[PDB]
Design an enzyme around this catalytic site. Structure first.
Site, short mmCIF file in Angstrom:
data_model
loop_
_atom_site.label_atom_id
_atom_site.label_comp_id
_atom_site.label_asym_id
_atom_site.label_seq_id
_atom_site.Cartn_x
_atom_site.Cartn_y
_atom_site.Cartn_z
CG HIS A 14 44.91 -6.51 40.30
ND1 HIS A 14 45.61 -6.65 41.47
CD2 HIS A 14 44.66 -5.18 40.15
CE1 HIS A 14 45.74 -5.46 42.04
NE2 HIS A 14 45.18 -4.56 41.26
CG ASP A 113 45.93 -9.15 43.66
OD1 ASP A 113 46.06 -8.34 44.60
OD2 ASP A 113 46.13 -8.86 42.46
C1 LIG Z 1 42.30 -2.55 46.57
C2 LIG Z 1 42.23 -1.01 46.55
C3 LIG Z 1 40.92 -0.46 47.29
C4 LIG Z 1 40.05 0.39 46.25
C5 LIG Z 1 38.65 0.24 45.63
C6 LIG Z 1 37.67 1.35 46.18
C7 LIG Z 1 38.26 2.82 46.22
C8 LIG Z 1 39.75 2.95 45.79
C9 LIG Z 1 40.07 3.02 44.25
C10 LIG Z 1 40.23 4.29 46.34
C11 LIG Z 1 39.15 5.36 46.56
C12 LIG Z 1 37.95 5.26 45.58
C13 LIG Z 1 37.32 3.82 45.54
C14 LIG Z 1 36.01 3.86 46.32
C15 LIG Z 1 37.00 3.43 44.08
O1 LIG Z 1 36.82 2.22 43.75
O2 LIG Z 1 36.96 4.33 43.19
C16 LIG Z 1 40.58 1.83 46.43
C17 LIG Z 1 42.11 1.96 45.95
C18 LIG Z 1 42.63 0.87 44.93
C19 LIG Z 1 41.93 -0.47 45.11
O3 LIG Z 1 42.43 -1.45 44.13
C20 LIG Z 1 42.54 -0.96 42.80
O4 LIG Z 1 41.43 -1.42 42.08
C21 LIG Z 1 41.49 -0.91 40.77
C22 LIG Z 1 40.12 -1.11 40.08
O5 LIG Z 1 39.11 -0.36 40.72
C23 LIG Z 1 42.53 -1.71 40.00
O6 LIG Z 1 42.57 -1.21 38.68
C24 LIG Z 1 43.90 -1.86 40.73
O7 LIG Z 1 45.07 -1.16 40.29
C25 LIG Z 1 45.51 -1.19 38.95
O8 LIG Z 1 46.55 -2.10 38.70
C26 LIG Z 1 47.69 -2.02 39.52
C27 LIG Z 1 48.77 -2.99 39.07
O9 LIG Z 1 49.24 -3.56 40.28
C28 LIG Z 1 48.30 -0.61 39.72
O10 LIG Z 1 49.54 -0.45 39.04
C29 LIG Z 1 47.31 0.55 39.46
O11 LIG Z 1 47.97 1.63 38.84
C30 LIG Z 1 46.07 0.20 38.63
O12 LIG Z 1 45.08 1.17 38.83
C31 LIG Z 1 43.90 -1.49 42.24
O13 LIG Z 1 44.88 -0.47 42.36
C32 LIG Z 1 45.93 -0.59 43.32
O14 LIG Z 1 45.57 0.02 44.52
C33 LIG Z 1 46.81 0.43 45.06
C34 LIG Z 1 46.55 1.57 46.07
O15 LIG Z 1 47.58 1.57 47.04
C35 LIG Z 1 47.49 -0.76 45.72
O16 LIG Z 1 48.83 -0.45 46.07
C36 LIG Z 1 47.48 -2.03 44.84
O17 LIG Z 1 48.81 -2.33 44.47
C37 LIG Z 1 46.51 -2.01 43.61
O18 LIG Z 1 47.18 -2.49 42.48
C38 LIG Z 1 40.49 -0.28 44.96
#
Ligand SMILES: C[C@@H]1C[C@@]23CC[C@H]4[C@@](C)(CCC[C@@]4(C)C(=O)O)[C@@H]2CC[C@]1(O[C@@H]1O[C@H](CO)[C@@H](O)[C@@H](O[C@@H]2O[C@@H](CO)[C@@H](O)[C@@H](O)[C@@H]2O)[C@H]1O[C@H]1O[C@@H](CO)[C@H](O)[C@H](O)[C@@H]1O)C3
Ligand SMILES: O=c1ccn([C@@H]2O[C@H](COP(=O)(O)OP(=O)(O)O)[C@@H](O)[C@H]2O)c(=O)[nH]1
EC number: 2.4.1.-
Length: 443
Positions: A14, A113
């Protein structure tokens, strides 16, 4: 003069596109302020032309984020936590900055973002326009807005190999993998979409000829103007790296024949069993291809780095390193293919450098990126059924050596060329950037 404030999410995938965008806008004559958490901060000394202001986790640290771990899946809970409790501080910081502004200087807009959905009402309350930067693909967003039907058809509840309804591009398994953690995800995605629709504009890190089939969904669902700009074609993200580069890889790449090296990297946050890490190693060796494998310390559960790996097991053909300037490696002539976890930044960098891919995935948008790249654009091969040494070695050889894989290598070269053409006068990305600058200037 006009200033732009950008507010990234503090993770590598990001921070990179946001600071790429900031540099593009600086090149068009805007001054730049970056609001950033102290957590995962980039090296501000790499950006002497930007002003940094650190917010939201200054000590004394809030009881909510004070204890949170800095690594692992739990580290991402900062995102929903800041969304729910950061508004008052963000408003204070924006007002302070606007109060200290010079007379010849206006703040044109805030770019955040899309995951900072809480910023929309803050910006509204200051009469400040907010633009949103999407760090994931248009295809992924099209899947997001289709979640009603998905839950409706029973996809979201634990037919695996069937085409999804009204989404023939995906298999049901893809949807199940992408939206596996529904309860936690449903709320975040709902709010992110709603506040993206209410924004003054949406910047996409993509280009039109990459995602032509998804343009109509964006125009229909998002009333604000959308702008598609392939940031890796403007500059690499090397300056915003959160880890030190191992640049000794380039002397080693200089000893390899053209297109002979498989680059392997599973992103900045993924992690694997010890069981799977060793199977990945065996596939690599089994392919007989040269490889450069980036393994983040912490990638392997239960080891500090690569302790499970016997000494000398990579042999003459393989090297393992902690971290590289990834796009610069993808640009080197030795690289023949990229085994990726299908993060969007990695995927778009590989496309912009013309490197064909082998796809794995760790959920979220990754399975959708992998399916779109391998089946629609056909620039790679998708390992959609776990880790198995035999299947890994066949995928690697198919993309890098087999005559049967020539069309994939050719598709990747053509797609890079389409990206270059989009930046010329009259191309889609050139016109998007031109429109973006005149739009921001009119605010
Ligand atoms: C904002 C989301 C909420 C959250 C945090 C908490 C949660 C989750 C991880 C899911 C369940 C466990 C738990 C608790 C736990 O942190 O492990 C749960 C989902 C994901 C959350 O955000 C993620 O946080 C990661 C760090 O923890 C980053 O590395 C982000 O992503 C990184 O960079 C991107 C480039 O844009 C991607 O290409 C991606 O490949 C790569 O991993 C981001 O991924 C994506 O989430 C997609 C889900 O739909 C979105 O569509 C967004 O577009 C977003 O980009 C964290
Ligand atoms: O050794 C590495 C591995 C990756 N990256 C960069 O880290 C980012 C990873 O983002 P992505 O969206 O692909 O995956 P994420 O880590 O967010 O899951 C990309 O910009 C890569 O170029 C890098 O600079 N060096």
């Amino acid at each position: 003069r006009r200033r732009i404030i950008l507010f990234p999410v503090p993770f590598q995938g990001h921070i990179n596109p946001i600071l790429q965008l900031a540099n593009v806008l600086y090149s068009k004559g805007f001054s730049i302020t970056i609001f950033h958490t102290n957590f995962n901060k980039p090296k501000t000394s790499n950006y002497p032309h930007f002003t940094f202001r650190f917010i939201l986790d200054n000590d004394p640290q809030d009881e909510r984020i004070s204890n949170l771990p800095t690594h692992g899946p739990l580290a991402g809970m900062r995102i929903p936590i800041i969304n729910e409790h950061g508004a008052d501080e963000l408003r204070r910081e924006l007002e302070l900055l606007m109060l200290a502004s010079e007379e010849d200087e206006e703040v044109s807009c805030l770019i955040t973002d899309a995951l900072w959905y809480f910023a929309q009402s803050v910006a509204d309350s200051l009469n400040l326009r907010r633009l949103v930067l999407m760090t994931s693909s248009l295809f992924n967003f099209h899947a997001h807005v289709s979640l009603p039907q998905f839950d409706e058809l029973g996809y979201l509840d634990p037919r695996l190999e069937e085409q999804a309804s009204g989404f023939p591009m995906l298999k049901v398994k893809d949807i199940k993998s992408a939206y596996s953690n529904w309860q936690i995800l449903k709320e975040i995605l709902g709010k992110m979409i709603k506040q993206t629709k209410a924004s003054s504009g949406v910047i996409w890190n993509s280009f039109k000829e990459l995602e032509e089939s998804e343009l109509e969904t964006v125009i229909r669902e998002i009333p604000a103007p959308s702008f598609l700009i392939p940031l890796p074609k403007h500059l690499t993200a090397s300056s915003s790296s959160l880890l030190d580069h191992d640049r000794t890889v380039f002397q080693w790449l200089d000893q390899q024949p053209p297109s002979s090296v498989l680059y392997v990297s599973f992103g900045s946050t993924s992690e694997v069993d010890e069981k799977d890490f060793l199977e990945i190693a065996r596939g690599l060796v089994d392919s007989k291809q040269s490889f450069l494998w980036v393994v983040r310390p912490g990638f392997v559960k239960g080891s500090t780095w690569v302790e499970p790996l016997p000494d000398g097991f990579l042999g003459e053909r393989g090297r393992i390193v902690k971290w590289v300037p990834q796009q610069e490696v993808l640009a080197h002539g030795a690289i023949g293919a990229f085994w990726t976890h299908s993060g969007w930044n990695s995927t778009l960098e590989s496309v912009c450098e013309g490197v064909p891919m082998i796809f794995s995935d760790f959920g979220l948008d990754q399975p959708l990126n992998a399916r779109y790249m391998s089946d629609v654009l056909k620039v790679g091969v998708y390992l959609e059924n776990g880790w198995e040494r035999g299947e890994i070695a066949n995928a690697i050889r198919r993309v890098m050596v087999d005559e049967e894989g020539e069309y994939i290598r050719q598709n990747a070269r053509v797609l890079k060329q389409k990206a270059d053409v989009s930046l010329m006068k009259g191309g889609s990305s050139y016109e998007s950037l031109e429109s973006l600058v005149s739009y921001i200037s009119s605010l």
